[PDB]
Subunit: 759 residues, 2 copies
Amino acid sequence: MDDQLKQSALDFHEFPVPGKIQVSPTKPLATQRDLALAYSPGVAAPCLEIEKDPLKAYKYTARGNLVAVISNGTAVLGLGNIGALAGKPVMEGKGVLFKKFAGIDVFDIEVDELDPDKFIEVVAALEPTFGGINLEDIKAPECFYIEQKLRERMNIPVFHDDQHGTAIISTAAILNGLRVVEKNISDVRMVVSGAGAAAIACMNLLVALGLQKHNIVVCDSKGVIYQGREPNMAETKAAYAVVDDGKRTLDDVIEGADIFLGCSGPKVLTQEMVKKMARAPMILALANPEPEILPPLAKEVRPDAIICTGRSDYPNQVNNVLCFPFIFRGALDVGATAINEEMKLAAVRAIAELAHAEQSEVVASAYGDQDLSFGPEYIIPKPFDPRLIVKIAPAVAKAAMESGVATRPIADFDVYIDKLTEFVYKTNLFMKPIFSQARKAPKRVVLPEGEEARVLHATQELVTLGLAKPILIGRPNVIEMRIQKLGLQIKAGVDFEIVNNESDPRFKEYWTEYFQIMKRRGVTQEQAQRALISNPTVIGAIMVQRGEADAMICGTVGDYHEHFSVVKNVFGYRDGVHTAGAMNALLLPSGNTFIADTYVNDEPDAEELAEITLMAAETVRRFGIEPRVALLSHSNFGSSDCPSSSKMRQALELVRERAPELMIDGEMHGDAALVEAIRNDRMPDSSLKGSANILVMPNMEAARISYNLLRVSSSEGVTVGPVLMGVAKPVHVLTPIASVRRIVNMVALAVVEAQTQPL
Amino acid sequence: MDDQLKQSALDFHEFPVPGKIQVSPTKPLATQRDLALAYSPGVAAPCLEIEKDPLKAYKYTARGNLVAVISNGTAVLGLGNIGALAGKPVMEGKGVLFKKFAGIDVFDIEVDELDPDKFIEVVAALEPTFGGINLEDIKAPECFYIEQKLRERMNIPVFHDDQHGTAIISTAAILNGLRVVEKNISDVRMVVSGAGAAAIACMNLLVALGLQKHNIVVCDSKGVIYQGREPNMAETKAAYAVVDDGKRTLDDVIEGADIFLGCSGPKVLTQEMVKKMARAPMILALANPEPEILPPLAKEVRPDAIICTGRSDYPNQVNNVLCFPFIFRGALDVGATAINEEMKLAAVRAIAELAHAEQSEVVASAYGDQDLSFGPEYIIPKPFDPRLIVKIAPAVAKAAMESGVATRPIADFDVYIDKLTEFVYKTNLFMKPIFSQARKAPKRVVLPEGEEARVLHATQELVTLGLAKPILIGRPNVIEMRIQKLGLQIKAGVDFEIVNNESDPRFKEYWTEYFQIMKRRGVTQEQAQRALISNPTVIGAIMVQRGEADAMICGTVGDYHEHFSVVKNVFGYRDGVHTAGAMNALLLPSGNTFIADTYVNDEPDAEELAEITLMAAETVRRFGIEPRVALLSHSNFGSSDCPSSSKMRQALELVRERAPELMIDGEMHGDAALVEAIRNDRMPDSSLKGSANILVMPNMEAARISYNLLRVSSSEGVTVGPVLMGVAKPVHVLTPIASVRRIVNMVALAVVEAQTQPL
């Protein structure tokens, strides 16, 4: 293990504060009332409820999201027995992983006890604190006895992940492989190396899944484990003892075998006995920190070999992080009393089915141009796939539903999946009304920049959600080749339409219409033809204008203002308005907030500010929020008389003249706008209540600087912008640094805008 | 208990997320390297260290800041035995209090066990997880046995706070009271009502403190507990069994007594037997939720009565929150193996001494115009006093030092107290170089606004820190009366000087000099006299100019620009400069950051921007930081050609011409300035490294809006501003909403600036 890596690990664990976890409150503790409610005499009130009903304990405490990771330091991942105090950082890291990947609060516990019975007594005593138990690093064979006793005795789910999770992943992998090579589960022959508990659980699951016991072979360091080899051998080991046939060595039984499993040590297998078994071997190496064999050797000696390792640098890694947080999430969200094998089967099926679907953006970006399509080189999902929780947790919850172990049944699964998604993507809670409205009637959207990888990913995700009917512009060859490269599943002509800009049958009409529009703006006919050949944005705008589409989303490459100029020239302002603006959404501690204007006007006057305010209010109303506007300046309610403050005052009077029912006030400082108490101290009778959610700035300088600084400082770094208002058709212009999720959000928003007859 | 209060408590405990705690990471977990370091194979590296040395476990894990709150639900605060699962919210609230008041991470644990021996076994088994144990809600007499066994058996400190903390507070209160009434500890006679463990610990401490056992009387519900009353009575109860004298009732022993203690129930004491004991009774009611008597009754029947209750609405509340977090902080920071009575004595002495000192701003604001000076009405500090940690924890640490139970001795106490203060005030870490430099040579500072409460509090805190020699301006009568009202301790003429603006012997020279300065600016002699009578800022500026002071801090009432105009007129620009600016400090996730210009120039040009940049760089250098400047705009490295961007480009070239060694670049977006990767993606060869810590805006609009929004959104809401640069003398102008701490910080900064010869 590298000395520099060791130094990096020590410095990471040390600075700037020792440890890796921290306990924080989730409530305000500022005033005296917070103290009164969070402690005596307030804290007594919920307590009585728990006395009347234990189930209500799942309703006022963290018990419904608390998991214990208990260890004794006897079976650390690669160090054997070193003491629990030595093993504490491992459990801290496990808890960090829990919180990161499933939003589950954990307590790590080291119990200095070696007697299994006293261990059981302690764990059973600690029951009311937690809602679930996960064991870790307990050596065999004590682990089986402890787990069985606790599962029988305790009333909450218990795992030993090293005994179960690896079994889940291996079962899913081998089932998928048998799907690949088209071999029936009945006639496959099983060969097992090592006596690690993962192997035993694997045979248990496979037998419960359909594998036949007469085709299995279990081999320890003593060779073939046949009946009568020794009388005082373990009963668990005896359960897989076969009728003796004279074979003693692993070489005798490996020939003609279908699947090889190993969790004992490196170099046990060799390329000759790799030649020994049947067609399409199933190499499965789980030994750490080195595998049984080198996958290059197995692949060079046999091409169709399938190899799975426990190391990240090799394809098809079996990492336990794929399972445990999600099974615990599913179990806890229904209050299952215990986790049976039904849940494990459901998890295996979920992993297998997820292995078939299309690749996500994160993993595709992370793992480069590797041939990551379904098949021998890609058989199980990567650890960082975000769809894992959404595909696993509802399945485990339904398995709990069927077996009757649930105690708090869920009504319908749709809101559950929605909540999980809001955990995953951090903007679903904000965008849910938009998605719900858009899904009722999809429209046609043009993405002129149809060769970018981000646009292709967004198109795939839009088709999957059934949220729009995309139209792409570009050369079909490049688009198809990149679709193959990224391993997507959308098919041209079935899920979306491709418009070949270099050669289209409607070129004549398009450039004729463009010239008819722009002849008085200094555009000759040759310029019109050249533009309709070379500029995708013009093609998209013309397509939208003629009614062959319904919305356009552009601007993910190049400058903002060229796209905006083209759009404004083609479409023009909507009736009753003489200006356009851009507005960015943001998530501050005080809630969602919109900022305008950030992109269009460099120095708006009072009239433009009034029109921008009205359009912003309408757009916010679309989100199902009650608009609350604030005009910002360095002047604080007339404390200065620079021209900007006067412009704000005139804009405010204009807005109050036009829309009398809108909640608006100003001009004020930012803190007064965002904080109720500060505003009430200086202006007790203001017409603005609560915290404002629309902020109007005097110039694009202030808007852009504030937006960027808040975007970075509000530690999320996510937005919904720039929404463009004032143009006569539902079009938006993005920025080159826009991510996939923002593109999807704007496509949904444009669809929603286009659903109604454009105003 | 009010139904509306019950509903409020339930809704507080329920929404928006169940529970009150949450476990969060303290390290980044974004990249693959974070995963590699926080888990396999990186996590193995520190583990081996723990195997080689257990003490190093205090160095890479949260064990050094982790406390367990263990309960069985048998002795809840006012509900007796209700079950541990019913009592869980109480421990959650206790842990929240721990984190809020001492920055200590806790695990709350409910053990469903009623056998004391099994309880002891479980707790002793859980030792390696934690660094300290605190018991809670365990009924007598099992609590004594469990605590004794665990203390003997376990190697980390253990408390039962209800048994010890109340004893600490009561001991401090009664010792202070005996100080008040001037009664010797030898001859005072003790009367005890109830058998609550707090009482027994109180007698133990008092006997260990100097109270004589022959003057004590212990009375249970059976009356006088004398020797031979019953043979099979408790040994702990037997330890205070007195030689029989024939007295049987509490009435017989209360007459002639000095101190009455009660923790049994309400209405036990009556006003006649209040008349029974000696002069100046010591009523001490700890029963909940109602006291033994109504304090109004005791005070009306006898004026000099001293009454202490356990309820917030009455004076001198005995709340356990005063002790336990701070004793645990002190014990943990030295690694004490156990907490003996030496630490408890040190804590009692610390509380007693703190009761004498001056009142803090927070408690004085919270508790109104009550006569909160030292005496019968104020005998123990309020729960929210921030000095509690600083006064307690070092004393407990030193007590650990003397008794040899410490395992990680501290070198010197000064850095310890500094670290505690940085925890308390959140800006000491930033301002420490300034305070250290200023404390070496204090100067003379004028605060013209010498009648505000905030200014008086700041003066008190400045005198205490020995950081300046303040001078106040105002009417002496009002100043003295308010000093009495707030209960401060600074004495006029000894700690500070008062300048009577209405009648001063130097009026003639002052107004003559003001006229000599301002005669050509339209100020007649009568106007000069009127100004020197009515305007404190002018008096302060003239005093500074003549050399009778060294710095001035003004502007906590009224508009900014009037004060700034007066200051600029009197002092003028420093040589080589033709402009002035203001700069605000702020604490973002990327570090400390300065923003300019926020208050002076409405629309600076290139030259003013260059001068402001240079002055800001020098001021930042004062803080011992290496300056890094960024010029912000909506244009991103020339993407636009509006006049503002051109002004930035000219300013940048000017700055590079003047100071060639300064690190500066621009103009850029905010995120590019703050984030390294974004800047490196667009401009790989920029001259700015890391994250900038000075931001220069094109106009006061953007600066003010960004500053306010970031101030609120960066969840601290604390600043150090506005620092004023460009004037020839060390003066600063604050804002009316400035708090005490900001005033202290600016006084220190002005002193530091004035220490060197002004440039």
